[PDB]
Design a protein around this ligand. Structure first.
Ligand SMILES: CC(=O)n1cc(-c2c(C)nn3c2OCC3)c2ccccc21
Ligand SMILES: CC(=O)n1cc(-c2c(C)nn3c2OCC3)c2ccccc21
Length: 102
């Protein structure tokens, strides 16, 4: 179905130069205040596990997780911080590739 294009997007996100903040869950023991500020953490590796398991009913639930990744990034990180700057590049990349398939 749709979800073949989700694998293309997820694979390209996973291998993108600016993906290093999003390849694994934020470790809250290492990031002060993260556990308190971000209610629903999300990251690329969690989406890959869900997608392999087939846990995405629609291309839209996949996109909701992807946008959750970048909403969380913008909530916690200043736009001029290193993680913030990476998040912006990754978010614009996502919605660019997303618009080219849907
Ligand atoms: C997604 C996100 O907001 N963040 C991700 C990292 C992160 C991860 C997942 N790995 N490494 C990081 O910074 C160096 C190595 C991080 C760090 C500080 C503040 C916010 C952070
Ligand atoms: C998963 C995660 O959130 N993080 C991982 C590191 C990390 C690791 C796994 N190794 N080294 C690191 O920073 C020095 C060397 C890290 C650092 C700061 C903030 C968050 C971080």
């Amino acid at each position: 179905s749709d979800l073949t294009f989700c694998e293309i997007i997820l694979m390209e996100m996973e291998s993108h130069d600016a993906a290093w903040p999003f390849l694994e869950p934020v470790n809250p023991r290492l990031v002060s205040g993260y556990r308190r500020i971000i209610k629903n953490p999300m990251d690329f590796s969690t989406m890959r596990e869900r997608l392999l398991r087939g846990g995405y009913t629609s291309s839209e639930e996949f996109a909701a997780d992807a946008l959750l990744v970048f909403d969380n990034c913008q909530t916690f990180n200043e736009d001029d911080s290193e993680v913030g700057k990476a998040g912006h590049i990754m978010r614009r990349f996502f919605e660019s590739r997303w618009e080219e398939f849907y």
